[PDB]
Nucleic acid binder design. Structure first.
Ligand SMILES: [Mg+2]
Lengths: 419, 474
DNA sequence: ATACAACCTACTACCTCAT
DNA sequence: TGAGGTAGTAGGTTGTATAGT
């Protein structure tokens, strides 16, 4: 007995259409034999074809594209239907599927030039209607439609190649956990020594004005050159709040709540950063929000660090990987590093108008893929590191903030086959 | 070394209860959730606007392919995809002429120029809609470039085209078009002449100013899917959503106009399992905050919104939802939520969820060019988690976010629930955007349309429009 | 008068649509 | 796809209380 609807086709030129035809047909109730569905591995791969077109193939559908009539594999596939065209002795056994808007008569193979046109050109639907309405006038066999079969195929077959696979994969953050915090945070009732009018961001240590007390991780003795007549401050007088408590929430003063205290660490951290980069070998890109740090041309050998290329070239403009420091306390206190792309037409003189910088940043980004953005960042943070396991930020002489130079790794079972 | 769990990709259901993961593929395979009687399409553009709009209707009957049809599925052809005809023969045109365009467009003010073309089209639309015995399923505003070019704030028509000096010394034309048509419910799909005929809009060089050969079928996907939805039926539903959930997306928009800089229009959009959506329009209050850079609500208006949502839910679904998630991008103040609390039935669970796209936890896959695939998540606490609605997708073999993807901080700010369900649901909600037909959006639809919505609330403020489905607000 | 409060404004990384 | 528009977020610029004449 014979039931199928063998589809003959050019791959990959007509794949879009054959996959649509077969699957719309299979869900409509037909049995469709199509190379698309299998993953053959035999010497009978062709004989499979032949066996199927020979015996069980009710209808030969051939994609009537330019590529399909010129394709050695489809011409060989076609060879049998004509051979079996006589055996069945039914005129409509072969159906050219005219999907190509641009078929010259000359391309079309003679056998199928003769036959009637299943017009997929004007609309894919009308012809689906025509192919089936043709399947009504001659009684080609059908099952009651189960589109469930349709996409059992699609979901198992087509999507076989690429889906979520139970795989293991780790991913590196851009969060860089703080390692060590100053044993206390102290607050200086600076009083006459403090001048409110003065700016402390040239005070070479992270300092800010909170109420009438003075906030920093620098011990009172630390500001000397720019802050005279302060040997007058009792060492005792100043609140010495336990930092190992503040993260916990153990500290809640009704005078100032921890939420106040957590916010306060950050400006310092980011300042401790901003000062550290004053003296750590990178020219700074200024965005209004905070600064970005891009190494200048030639500072690393051939503009590479640790095999990575952190300065390169685009068009007539060099590019230089830059980074930023957000520090966030929660969940775990970390330094965040967002990556950037600064730009210079020459080694070390920064481009003037960001409109060019925006267009360049977009243009150059297209180049960098997940592998690339990661290495450069990691290396940049590897770059800055002032020892084996972390960065130093200098809140003060005896007090330092140490950030891990390698970011939290996340390990997730479930990943995808890379194409 | 923390560990990521993974969220199975939510399944959206199409014709014959068959659900898969890509609307583009689900519609193509089976078609829409509720097949519809053919779209009658009405046009409100230049005589040229028709031929272009006819160009597309003829164009999208035939298949149109993307650059690479894996990362972007091809568009088989309207009739093949949706199993119904969106015919170009069957057009119901309300003309506009350059004389009308020139006369109203050239005003010195943008706003008096804007507001008036908008009133032009509406009369052209409303006259056709109200007066017509014949019936049009969607009104398609086919915008000549000259309109899109000049009808926004900050676009300066030269002082050498203005015929009338300004009478005295919002303004986005399309959003306003939707907002003024808001009181009388009519589906407005707005198209640009450049987009539908983008190869007939060459630049000085002779190449087209904007070149869409890479994505031309994707366009047909976005427009017909939106076209389809406006014309009535929804393309799909969430495949496996537990019964009786209520998704409430909190929207506000500061009204800059007021002297007191707290007037901020408010709304809530209600998503169930469809995404057809219901936009509950709240009225104008002091929601913006100076100190907190935040949006919030007084109880009494807040109770009205919850109840407006709950009651319209019960009228729709004959019960009160056993679970109601309210999404917004801000945390909730305990008073505003206790306002919700009271309105709520005793056994319904109310969940507040803050979806903040801060810039945290950019996760770089260790090996390979592609980023973490979407559905990976990081659970900080039983309450707050990191969700990747963006990043590599296998059925697309593309990253959704074209750079390294940013996950979204998800905190059950108020109420209690299972964060895993939250993540799930929210991953589910990205799938419901009928208008931009893609695999999934970056945002769940609850909050996806706020900013666009934010305009339409403030744009029309006199009205007191009933709760409305999305197609009106789109 | 200023000692401070709370805005508002660029600038940038993303993300969307007159898609 | 991409030229766009939007949304974070800092601040310096700015608009309001205090405080003393
Ligand atoms: Mg869209």
């Amino acid at each position: 007995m014979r039931n199928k609807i063998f589809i003959s086709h050019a791959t990959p030129e007509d794949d879009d259409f054959t996959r649509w035809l077969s699957l719309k047909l299979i869900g409509l109730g037909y049995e469709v034999w199509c190379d698309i569905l299998f993953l053959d591995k035999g010497v009978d791969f062709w004989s499979t074809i032949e066996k199927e077109i020979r015996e069980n193939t009710c209808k030969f559908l051939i994609v009537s594209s330019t590529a399909g009539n010129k394709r050695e594999g489809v011409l060989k596939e076609l060879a049998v239907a004509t051979k079996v065209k006589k055996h069945l002795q039914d005129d409509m056994f072969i159906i050219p599927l005219a999907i190509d808007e641009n078929l010259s008569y000359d391309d079309i193979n003679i056998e199928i030039v003769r036959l009637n046109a299943i017009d997929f050109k004007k609309s894919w639907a009308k012809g689906l209607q025509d192919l089936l309405d043709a399947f009504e006038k001659q009684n080609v066999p059908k099952k009651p439609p189960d589109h469930s079969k349709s996409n059992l195929l699609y979901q198992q077959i087509f999507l076989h190649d690429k889906q979520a696979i139970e795989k293991e994969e780790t991913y590196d953050s851009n969060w860089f956990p703080i390692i060590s915090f100053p044993n206390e945070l102290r607050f200086h009732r600076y009083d006459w020594r403090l001048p409110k009018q003065f700016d402390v961001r040239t005070l070479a240590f992270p300092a800010i004005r909170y109420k009438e007390y003075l906030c920093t991780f620098a011990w009172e003795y630390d500001f000397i050159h720019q802050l005279p007549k302060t040997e007058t401050y009792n060492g005792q007088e100043s609140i010495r709040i336990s930092t190992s408590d503040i993260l916990s929430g153990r500290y809640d003063t009704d005078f100032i709540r921890n939420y106040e205290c957590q916010r306060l660490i950050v400006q310092l951290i980011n300042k401790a950063f901003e000062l550290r980069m004053k003296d750590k070998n990178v020219r700074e890109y200024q965005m209004s929000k905070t600064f970005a740090y891009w190494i200048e041309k030639g500072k690393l050998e051939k503009d590479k660090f640790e095999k990575i290329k952190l300065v390169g070239k685009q068009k007539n403009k060099y590019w230089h990987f830059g980074i930023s420091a957000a520090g966030k306390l929660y969940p775990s206190p970390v330094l965040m590093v967002s990556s950037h792309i600064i730009f210079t037409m020459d080694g070390i003189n920064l481009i003037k108008s960001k409109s060019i910088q925006h267009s360049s940043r977009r243009k150059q980004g297209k180049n960098w893929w997940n592998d690339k953005w990661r290495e450069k960042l990691l290396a940049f943070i590897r770059f800055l590191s002032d020892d084996q396991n972390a960065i130093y930020l200098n809140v003060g002489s005896e007090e330092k903030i140490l950030i891990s130079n390698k970011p939290l790794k996340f390990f997730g079972k479930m990943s995808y086959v890379t194409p | 070394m923390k560990e990521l769990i993974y969220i199975e990709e939510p399944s959206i259901l199409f014709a014959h209860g068959q659900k898969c993961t890509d609307p583009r593929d689900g519609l193509a395979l089976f078609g829409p959730l509720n097949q519809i009687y053919g779209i009658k399409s009405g046009v409100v553009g230049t005589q040229k606007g028709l031929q272009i709009f006819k160009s597309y209707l003829d164009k999208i009957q035939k298949p149109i392919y993307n650059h690479n049809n894996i990362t972007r599925p091809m568009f088989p052809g309207f009739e093949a995809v949706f199993g119904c005809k969106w015919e170009s023969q069957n057009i119901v045109f309300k003309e506009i002429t350059d004389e009308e365009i020139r006369r109203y467009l050239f005003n010195a003010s943008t706003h008096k120029r804007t507001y008036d073309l908008v009133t032009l089209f509406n009369d052209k639309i409303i006259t056709a809609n109200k007066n017509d015995e014949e019936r049009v399923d969607v009104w398609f505003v086919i915008v000549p470039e000259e309109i899109y070019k000049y009808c926004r704030p900050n676009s300066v028509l030269p002082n050498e085209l203005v015929q009338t000096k300004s009478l005295i010394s919002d303004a986005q034309f399309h959003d306003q078009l939707k907002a003024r048509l808001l009181e009388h419910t009519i589906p407005t799909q707005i198209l640009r002449e450049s987009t539908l005929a983008w190869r007939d809009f060459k630049n000085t060089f002779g190449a087209p100013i904007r070149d869409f050969s890479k994505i031309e079928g994707h366009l047909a996907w976005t427009i017909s899917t939106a076209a389809y939805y406006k014309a009535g039926g929804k393309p799909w539903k969430l495949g496996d959503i537990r019964p009786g959930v209520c998704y409430l997306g909190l929207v506000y928009k500061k009204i800059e106009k007021s002297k007191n800089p707290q007037n901020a229009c408010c709304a809530a959009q209600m998503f169930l399992d469809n995404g057809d959506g219901t936009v509950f329009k709240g009225e104008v209050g002091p929601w913006y905050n100076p100190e907190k850079g935040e949006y919030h609500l007084k109880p009494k208006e807040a109770k009205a919104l919850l109840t407006q949502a709950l009651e319209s839910y019960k009228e729709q679904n004959k019960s009160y939802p056993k679970e109601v998630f309210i999404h917004a991008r801000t945390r909730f103040n305990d008073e505003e939520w206790n306002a919700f609390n009271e309105v709520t039935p005793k056994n319904t669970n109310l969940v507040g969820v803050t979806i903040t796209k801060s810039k945290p936890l950019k996760l770089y896959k260790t090996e390979g060019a592609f980023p973490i695939m979407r559905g990976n998540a990081y659970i900080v606490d039983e309450k707050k988690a990191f969700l990747w609605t963006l990043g590599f997708v296998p059925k697309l073999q593309s990253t959704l976010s074209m750079e390294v993807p940013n996950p979204i901080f998800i905190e059950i700010n108020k109420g209690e629930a299972e964060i895993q369900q939250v993540l799930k649901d929210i991953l589910a909600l990205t799938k419901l955007n009928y208008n931009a037909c893609i695999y999934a959006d970056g945002e769940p639809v609850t909050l996806r349309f706020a900013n666009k919505i934010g305009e339409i609330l403030t744009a029309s403020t006199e009205i007191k429009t009933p709760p409305l489905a999305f197609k009106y607000y789109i």
